[PDB]
Design a protein around this ligand. Sequence first.
Ligand code: K
Ligand code: K
Ligand code: K
Ligand code: K
Ligand code: K
Length: 418
Amino acid sequence: AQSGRNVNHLVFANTSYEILGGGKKYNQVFMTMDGKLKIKIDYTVDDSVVEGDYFTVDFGKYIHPGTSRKPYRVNNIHDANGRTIAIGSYDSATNTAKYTFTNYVDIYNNVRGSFSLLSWPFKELVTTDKQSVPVGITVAGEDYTQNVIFNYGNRTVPVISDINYLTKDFAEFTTYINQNRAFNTGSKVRLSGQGFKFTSPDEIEVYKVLNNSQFRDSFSPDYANLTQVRNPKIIINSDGSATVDLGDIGTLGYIIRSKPNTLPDFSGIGVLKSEYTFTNNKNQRDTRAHASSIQFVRAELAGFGGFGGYVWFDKNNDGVQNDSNAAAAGITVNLLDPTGIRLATTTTDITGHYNFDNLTNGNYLVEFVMPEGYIPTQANSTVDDKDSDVVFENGRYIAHVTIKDADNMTIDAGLVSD
Ligand SMILES: [K+]
Ligand SMILES: [K+]
Ligand SMILES: [K+]
Ligand SMILES: [K+]
Ligand SMILES: [K+]
């Protein structure tokens, strides 16, 4: 890995916020419409900054980068030609992004520009509709704060729901029942997804609510302080919908915390519909429903992957991995963007292997630095798990790799004397 230092003191950032979505005209982030908080950063970089140095963005107490999909990520920073200025990484433990300068800063001087991020509140802290919070962050060591109002549009109604968060494999959906605290009997809830399916009752948890304050407007309840119905009557239907029989709830509120699975190959507007059927305090049957929507493409939902490979001395010059005592240790491997900027570096270990992990989805070049007197062997001469993948292309010894939500791709290099 490329070494470097924290250069917050050499990068100057000017920051502003912009509220996006339907609440902009009300100066509010409308969390269940299309709302998010856009962070806009203008930055300058001193000439003394070098490849591997980095600046940080501390997102502080109330917000994180990204929106619905976890784990959260940040994108790389590019110039107008698409060249990578800095690679972006995010650590959830410190709620901080790290922007590590590439060799861009060793080609170009007076580096400066702008980038932006989308951000969302921690729903366990920003709990309440119309709540103003001091959104204080630090960008390259420069503090910025502004008060921002969030609104989830919670309503005191028999049934309402939201998607709490989304992951590669499942979403967590929150269904609130009887916030209106009507006397209800014969209460049942049917959960039906598009782009999502249930397989098992253990994917659904049911909680009683005695105090309305526990119905967080953010739809991310403090479950540790709610009594769980640990034996709930749940049926998974043949179509992958689920029915929850709550029984005679009386005036109690209920929360259903569900984790439907994302469907393989799904691409579009996913939906979970919560349909609540019950007998009201007039002894009349009633049916009410609420549906929550989320755009996703399952195949790229993680947003990152990784790859690695193997370097060896191709002792019989055939381009095949059929050579003994041949692993090449200490070979430098550089990861480049398509413009030729170096994003990362590593070296093969004693076993001949290298890898790059936690790589944002996209197209990369993989460059192998030749030991003195060596060149790549014949490329692509056999089956793709036993060949050498490196060619001389555009002045470099490289292979191409595309990262898309997988870490099983391999890129190997066989070496022969020149
Ligand atoms: K600074
Ligand atoms: K420099
Ligand atoms: K060989
Ligand atoms: K290969
Ligand atoms: K190949």
